[PDB]
C-alpha cells in the first residue's frame, strides 16, 4: 500500500473552482478527472489544514488524501512574522500524512505543494512520534517526494525536520535513559555521521573541575549521575583559523529543582530541561549535514539537578569559572548556574557570536507561551538575523529586554557578586537573562529562553503532542544564512 | 530658606577635573571658587545619581546639593532604548530635590542641567508623594528653574511630570475615595482647567445600558458603587471634523476579583486597577495643556469588581456591545470585559488610532516587570511611534505579540464566541490581548498592558515608592509628536 498526499488551494474570487497544485492537477488528469469529480461530490471546499480522503482513484494509490493549502499566494504575514504559505503547507501536509498513517499505510508520496522544503518539514515533523519504549506503535510511514523535480528542496526539508526531530527525541526520552552521558553519546554519533570534519569531547567531571566550573559542579553534585561537559566542533570553514560561532545549551537531563524541590504536578516534563542542549546540538548536527562553510562550536554542560545529602543548599555561594561568586538562593534556578560556566568557557574560542538556548524560566512561558522563543541579545544585528530566519521556518522568536534594570535586581546580592534569583518575582525571564549577561562580555550574544516552546499540545499543527524541539530549525536557518551572508 | 540643586558631570579622561554644568560653574564663580574647593575637600567624585550637600556657601543658598549627572554627552543608549542623558538628569535632580526636602527647605532652584525638561521632570516626579490622608507630611517643596533661559523646556517638563503625577494621584488614592464618580469628576475638572476646547460626559448606568454594554455592566453589577463611562473630548484640531485619536483605559477603581476572589496579600494595590484610565486620561489632560492641534477622545469605563449576591458568576455568558458573547470563566479577568465594550464604542468615533491602556495581567508583570510597558499592536507604524516617544521619556515600552496563536486559545470557548481567559495558563498577557483584539477591527490599534509598571519600589530612581503613573509621559510625547509629524 502506497498513499498520496495532494494539495488544493482555497478558491480565489476570480476562479470558478479551487485550484489543485501542479501535482494535484496532474494526478486528476491521470485519473481522467475522477479526483475533481469526487472532491466536488464530497461537499464543501477544503480549507487550510483540512483534509479529505478518497479511495480507489488509482491502482497505485488506493488512498489519496487531499489537503487544503489555503491561499496560493500567501506569503510573509506582517502580523504573524512568518511566511504564511510555508506554515499552511507544513500543517496541511502533516495532517495529510497523519491520515495516511491512521490508514496504516507504510509509504506515502507527498505533493511538493509549490514548496518542497515546507512540504517535507510538514511530513517529517508531522509524522514524528517518540515511541521507542512502547509495545503498541503506529505504522512506520516512509514519506517521499511525489515527483522528481524538487528533490534538493525536499531533502532540505527532511534535513531541517530531522534536526528538529533529533532535538524532540533527546527531549522526550525519559531522563533515566537520556542521561548526560547518553545525551553526549547520541549527539556524538549524530554529529560524526553528519560529517568527519568534526571533533567531540565528552568532558568528564575531572575536566570540569580542572576548568574551575564551580557553578556547574554545584548543580551536578546533588545527583549520583555523572556530569559531562559536551564540547563539539564542526570545522566547516575553508579556513581552519576562522573564528567559530559558539552555541551553548542548558543540559539539565532532569530537574527536580533540587533542595528547592519542584511540585509533583507535571514534573515529568523536566526530562526536557536539557532542551537547550538538544536544540543547539541538533542545529549543529544539521549544519554539518548541510556542510555549511563555517566553524561552529557547541557547548553543553549536562547534569541532573537532584536533592540529596550533598546537593546545592539555598544560600550556598559558588564560584564561576570567571571568578565571580554566585549566591544560590534557589537551587531550582540551576540552568543559569551551569550556563554561567559554559558561557565563560565559550569566550575562550574567540567566537564571532555566542548563542545559548535554555528551557530557562517558567516566566518565559507565562510571558509568551509557545507562541515564540524569547530572545535576549545585546546585538540588534543578531536579533534581526534570528528574526529573519524565524520568518522562514515559522518557528518564531520574539525579542525580550536586556536592561540594566533587571541586572540591578540580580547583582543586589547579600553574600556574593550575583544572586541566582532576582530580588523581586517580576520579569523572571529578564532577570534570568540579566544573570547570564554577567558572564558574557561578547558583543554578539543571544540568549534564547525556550521554556515556553519546550512542548506542544496543538499550537503548532505539524507537531504532535510532546516535546517540540523548538526552535532548532530557526537556528539551522540562521546558520545557513550566516554561512552565505554574514 | 531656599535650596539649590546643581549638577556636575563625570570626569572625562581628557579633563583634569569633573565639569560643572553652566549653572554650577557660574555659582562656583559667584562664591569665588568655594563650591569647587569644598567639593574637592569632600572626597570622591560624584557619580551619576549621587548627591552631596554643602552648607553656607551663599547667603541666599544655605544648602547647595550637587548631583552627579554622569557622562555629559550621554545620549541614546542603543541597549537600553532610552536617552541615557535625560534619565541621568531625572534621577540626579530627583535625588537632589529629595535631599533639599529632607532638610525641610520649602523652596528649591534647579539647575537645568543642559536639559530643562528632564531636570523639571526629575524634580516634579521626584518630589511627588500622595500624602493627602496623612497627618504627618514632608515639607511641601516648590521647585523652580534656576535661571531664566530655559523656561519653556522647564515648564514642558513640569507639565509632563504633572500629567504623570495626576495619574499617580488617581492610582494611589484609596478606592473608597477614588470611586468611578470621583475619578470622573477629578479628570473632568483637570481637563476643563487645561482647556475650554473640551467636553466631558460622565455617562451614567442608564446610558451604559442604552449602549448595550452588557460586558461592562456584568462587571459593575456586583458592587453597590455606581458605574460610569467617562467620555472626554479634547477638540484641539483646527478642523472640528478631523478624525480624533481615541484612548481607552481600564477603570476598575477597585478589583477584589469578584466571585473569582483574589488572595488577600497586597490586594490593596488593586485600588490602582484603574491605572489604564488614569494614564490615558492624564495624557489627554496634558495634551490639552500643551494645546496640541489634534482631536482626542478619551474613553474610560469605570466600576468596581466586587463579590456579592448579584455579582458576575463564573461561566456566565454576557453580550458585548458588538453582539459578541463572552464566557466569563474567571470574574477576575474583568478588565478585558469592560474594555470589550469600550473598544467597541471607540470605533464609533472613526478614530485615526485607538490606544488602550490597562493594568490587565499579572502575566505582563511576570513577563517584563516594571522594565517596560507591554505594547500589543497590529500596526508597526504605531509601535514605532510609541517606541520612539518612549526613548525620549525614558518610560519604556516593549512590543508583545498579537498572534492568532493566542486568539485561538480564547475563541476556543465552550459556551460563547470568546472566553475571557485562555484555555492554557501560558502567555497570559498575550491571550488577554488576543481577547481585546476580538473587539477591534481598526487598522491602528495598540493595547498597553501596564500591570507591570503599575507600581514603583526603586526601579525608576525619580519615582518614590508607590503607584507610578506609567507610561503617561510616553503617551503625551506620542501625542505631541503625532500633532507635529503624523
Ligand atoms: C523553569 C525554571 C528553571 S528549571 C524554574 O523552574 N525556576 C527558576 C526559578 S524562578 C523563581 C521562583 C521563585 C523565587 C525566585 C525565582 C526557580 C524555579 C521556579 O520557577 O520555581
Ligand atoms: C491582573 C489581572 C487583572 S485584575 C488578574 O488578576 N487576573 C486576570 C486573570 S489571569 C488567569 C488566572 C488563572 C486562570 C485563567 C486566567 C485572572 C486574574 C489572576 O491573575 O488570577
Ligand atoms: Na530528555
Ligand atoms: Na486609586
Ligand atoms: Zn530548575
Ligand atoms: Zn532547569
Ligand atoms: Zn481582576
Ligand atoms: Zn483588573
From Swiss-Prot, chains A, B:
Nucleus recorded as keyword: no
GO MF assignments: carboxypeptidase activity; dipeptidase activity; disordered domain specific binding; manganese ion binding; metalloaminopeptidase activity; peptidase activity
Binding site for Mg(2+): 255, 332, 334
Binding-site list for Zn(2+) 1: 255, 332, 334
Protein residues bound to Zn(2+) 3: 170-171, 173, 271
InterPro entries: Leucine_aapep/pepB, Macro_dom-like, Peptidase_M17_C, Peptidase_M17_leu_NH2_pept, Peptidase_M17_N
Alphabetical keyword list: Acetylation, Aminopeptidase, Cobalt, Cytoplasm, Dipeptidase, Hydrolase, Magnesium, Manganese, Metal-binding, Phosphoprotein, Protease, Zinc
N6-acetyllysine carried by residues: 423, 457
Hydrolase as UniProt keyword: yes
Record GO biological process: proteolysis
GO CC annotation terms, alphabetical: cytoplasm; mitochondrion
Cofactor requirement: Zn(2+); Mn(2+)
Oligomeric form and interacting partners: Homohexamer.
Protein name: Cytosol aminopeptidase
Top-level taxonomy: Eukaryota, Metazoa, Chordata, Craniata, Vertebrata
Amino acid at each position: 500500500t502506497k498513499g498520496l498526499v495532494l494539495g488544493i488551494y482555497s478558491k480565489e474570487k476570480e476562479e470558478d473552482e479551487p485550484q489543485f497544485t501542479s501535482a494535484g492537477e496532474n494526478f486528476n488528469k491521470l485519473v481522467s478527472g475522477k479526483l475533481r469529480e469526487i472532491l466536488n461530490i464530497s461537499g464543501p471546499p477544503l480549507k487550510a489544514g483540512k483534509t479529505r480522503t478518497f479511495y480507489g482513484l488509482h491502482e497505485d494509490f488506493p488512498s489519496v488524501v487531499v489537503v487544503g493549502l489555503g491561499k496560493k499566494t500567501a506569503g510573509i504575514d506582517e502580523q504573524e512574522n512568518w511566511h504564511e504559505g510555508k506554515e499552511n503547507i507544513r500543517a496541511a501536509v502533516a495532517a495529510g500524512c497523519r491520515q495516511i498513517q491512521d490508514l496504516e499505510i507504510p509509504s506515502v508520496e507527498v505533493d511538493p505543494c509549490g514548496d518542497a522544503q515546507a512540504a517535507a518539514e510538514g511530513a517529517v515533523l508531522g509524522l514524528y512520534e517518540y515511541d521507542d519504549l512502547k509495545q503498541k506503535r503506529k505504522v512506520v510511514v516512509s514519506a517521499k517526494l511525489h515527483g522528481s523535480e524538487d528533490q534538493e528542496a525536499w531533502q532540505r526539508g527532511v534535513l531541517f525536520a530531522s534536526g528538529q526531530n533529533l532535538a524532540r527525541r533527546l527531549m522526550e526520552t525519559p531522563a533515566n535513559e537520556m542521561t548526560p552521558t547518553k545525551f553526549a553519546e547520541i549527539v556524538e554519533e549524530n554529529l560524526k555521521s553528519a560529517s568527519i570534519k568534526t571533533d567531540v569531547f565528552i568532558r568528564p567531571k575531572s575536566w570540569i573541575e580542572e576548568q574551575e566550573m564551580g557553578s556547574f559542579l554545584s548543580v551536578a553534585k546533588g545527583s549520583e549521575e555523572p556530569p559531562v561537559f559536551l564540547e563539539i566542533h564542526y570545522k566547516g570553514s575553508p579556513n581552519a583559523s576562522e573564528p567559530p560561532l559558539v552555541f551553548v545549551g542548558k543540559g539539565i537531563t532532569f530537574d527536580s529543582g533540587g533542595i528547592s524541590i519542584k511540585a509533583a504536578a507535571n514534573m515529568d516534563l523536566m526530562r526536557a530541561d536539557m532542551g537547550g542542549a538538544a536544540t543547539i546540538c541538533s542545529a549543529i548536527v544539521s549544519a554539518a549535514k548541510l556542510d555549511l562553510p563555517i566553524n561552529i562550536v557547541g557547548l553543553a554542560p549536562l547534569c541532573e539537578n537532584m536533592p540529596s545529602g550533598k546537593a546545592n543548599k539555598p544560600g550556598d555561594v559558588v564560584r564561576a569559572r570567571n571568578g565571580k561568586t554566585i549566591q544560590v538562593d534557589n537551587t531550582d534556578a540551576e540552568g543559569r548556574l551551569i550556563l554561567a560556566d559554559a558561557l565563560c568557557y565559550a569566550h575562550t574560542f574567540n567566537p564571532k557570536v555566542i548563542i545559548n538556548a535554555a528551557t530557562l524560566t517558567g516566566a518565559m512561558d507565562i510571558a509568551l507561551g509557545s507562541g515564540a522563543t524569547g530572545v535576549f541579545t545585546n546585538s540588534s544585528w543578531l536579533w534581526n538575523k534570528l528574526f529573519e530566519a524565524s520568518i522562514e521556518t515559522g518557528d518564531r522568536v520574539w525579542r525580550m529586554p536586556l536592561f540594566e534594570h533587571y541586572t540591578r535586581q540580580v547583582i543586589d546580592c547579600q553574600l556574593a557578586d550575583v544572586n541566582n534569583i532576582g530580588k523581586y518575582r517580576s520579569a523572571g525571564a529578564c532577570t534570568a537573562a540579566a544573570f547570564l549577561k554577567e558572564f558574557v562580555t561578547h558583543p554578539k550574544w543571544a540568549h534564547l529562553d525556550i521554556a515556553g516552546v519546550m512542548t506542544n499540545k496543538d499550537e503548532v499543527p505539524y507537531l504532535r503532542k510532546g516535546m517540540a524541539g523548538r526552535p532548532t530549525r530557526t537556528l539551522i536557518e540562521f546558520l545557513f544564512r550566516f554561512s552565505q551572508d554574514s
